[PDB]
């Protein structure tokens, strides 16, 4: 084999951070690094799925862009007890954590704009890849915030071929067409721009989108009943314009990330 991956025996598990439908996250140490260990949850593991994990992981190892957070390595299973991903520990956690679960100063609107620019840069980069990294969904849980407050798109949050294919757990950020059509039948780049518009919404409101609804309700109402985020009042014209065009009903009228980067760069403090 070309790579054997990380040796599971070398990982020191320190503290449990989280658990959900996808697996468990633990803070740890490995070869002098502070890491997060993601132990994936899978039913009916097989040789085929193991082979797939090992072929899918190397695409996640992106070390050339400051706004992309790579997978540092992965533990192949067998011989690890379960398929596992390792990433460097990002001290502020996810964008979601920072915006919605902060315990201290509230991040200011300058910092929010810098988050938006960072995310757009990272997405513009990921959109240059051929083919696109499959099953990558942008949302506030899948962006991490590093020590100097840089936002980085999290490659460990990409779903694998064997994970939960018909279960969507963050539909509020998903484009209406993507709630209804197979990925093969949608323009994935345009769908990703909707997700970015919802993240702009979240940065403006500092609220969780559709926080009062369950995930099923959200997807059904967005897909079939025209439910949309309400454009917030009292915002600048160019923020309003940008959110509206990024969230256009027609996927083909939404901009490319590399066409919004220069708008966001003007909006920054310098």
């Amino acid at each position: 084999n070309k790579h054997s991956g990380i040796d599971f025996k070398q990982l020191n598990f320190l503290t449990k951070l989280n658990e959900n439908h996808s697996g468990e996250w633990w803070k740890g140490r490995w070869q002098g690094n502070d890491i997060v260990v993601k132990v994936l949850k899978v039913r009916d593991w097989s040789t085929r799925k193991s082979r797939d994990f090992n072929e899918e992981c190397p695409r996640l190892r992106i070390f050339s862009h400051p706004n992309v957070l790579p997978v540092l390595g992965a533990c192949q299973s067998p011989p690890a007890p379960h398929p596992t991903l390792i990433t460097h520990w990002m001290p502020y956690g996810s964008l979601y954590n920072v915006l919605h679960e902060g315990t201290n100063f509230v991040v200011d609107q300058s910092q929010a704009v810098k988050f938006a620019l960072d995310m757009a840069r990272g997405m513009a980069f990921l959109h240059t890849l051929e083919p696109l990294i499959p099953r990558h969904a942008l949302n506030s849980r899948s962006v991490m915030i590093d020590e100097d407050m840089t936002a980085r798109i999290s490659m460990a949050d990409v779903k694998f071929s064997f994970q939960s294919p018909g279960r969507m757990y963050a539909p509020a950020w998903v484009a209406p067409e993507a709630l209804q059509k197979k990925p093969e039948d949608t323009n994935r780049r345009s769908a990703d721009m909707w997700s970015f518009a919802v993240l702009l919404w979240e940065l403006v409101t500092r609220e969780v989108p559709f926080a009062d609804l369950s995930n099923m309700e959200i997807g059904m109402k967005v897909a079939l009943e025209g439910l949309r985020p309400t454009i917030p009042p009292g915002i600048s014209p160019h923020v309003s314009k940008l959110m509206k065009i990024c969230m256009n009903e027609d996927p083909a009228k939404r901009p490319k990330f590399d066409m919004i980067v220069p708008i966001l760069e003007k909006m920054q403090d310098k």
């Binding site: 439908h21 039948d185 059904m220």
Partner: protein, 124 residues
């Protein structure tokens, strides 16, 4: 317990039917869907799919199942998908075959619904 109750305990069975109608509507009514009878409204698998997303906190993308099944085969596929979702959440493989639900076998339908109720009865 379940088979004794179904075949021999008629009043206990009506309380089970009523509790189950209340339980499924508590969730389905969030989507403006209403169940009035257990005998046929789960047979096409659609509500079972929708219910599983309501109980376990996900949406099911509309291309993953048949929202308006136009054949026996499509219904069977829906119900089989719903049973996978139940297993993904930690239930054992259900006892009825998916075909038993599509063919409106009451005992099969109520056993599936009763195992959901037992596990998920405290979900808001």
């Amino acid at each position: 317990a379940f088979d004794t109750l179904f075949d021999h305990a008629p009043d206990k069975l009506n309380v089970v039917k009523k509790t189950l109608i209340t339980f499924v509507n508590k969730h389905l009514n969030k989507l403006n869907l209403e169940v009035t009878e257990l005998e046929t409204q789960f047979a096409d698998g659609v509500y079972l799919v929708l219910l599983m997303g309501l109980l376990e906190g996900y949406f099911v993308p509309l291309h993953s199942f048949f929202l308006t099944p136009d054949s026996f085969e499509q219904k069977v596929l829906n119900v089989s998908f719903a049973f996978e979702l139940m297993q993904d959440g930690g239930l054992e493989k259900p006892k009825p075959r998916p075909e038993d639900i599509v063919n409106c076998d009451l005992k099969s339908t109520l056993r599936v619904l009763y195992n959901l109720f037992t596990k998920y009865r405290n979900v808001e």
